[PDB]
Amino acid sequence: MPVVTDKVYFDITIGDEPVGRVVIGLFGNDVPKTVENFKQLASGENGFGYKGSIFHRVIRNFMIQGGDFTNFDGTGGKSIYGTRFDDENLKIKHFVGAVSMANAGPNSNGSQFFVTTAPTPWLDGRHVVFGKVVEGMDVVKKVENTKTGLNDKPKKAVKINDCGVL
């Protein structure tokens, strides 16, 4: 079990109703560069980041995907190191409540991430896992249960109304 070194929170709304807080524990001794990127995007300290962004793709019994604060539809986002950065460690395995980098092939992490809600071992070795949910799995449940339309887009927006570093 990787060790949790820092924690960040997201306060979620669904179509504007508050639905609670998720707290994500980060594995900062194992993937320090990936964890730095996520923290700073959660604090917004570079002038951009997660606050006000959405979970644009939600699949029940699979994952919820967010972090695209540039285009809001899964095509965008950016790291603190520029557009994209390399895979830090691909040895940490997925598990229920893992928090992991979306990508588009090797070494293309940006700001997009997912929280799994069931086992996803077919992603292992392919996406960098850098954290886990340590509180608010109930809230993660609500999100994965919203009504969705075309390409798994929630009908009501699922917003990170606020976030930051605990």
Partner: peptide
Amino acid sequence: XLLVTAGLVLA
């Protein structure tokens, strides 16, 4: 299949 990209999004 069940994937998590960043631009295209496959089966």
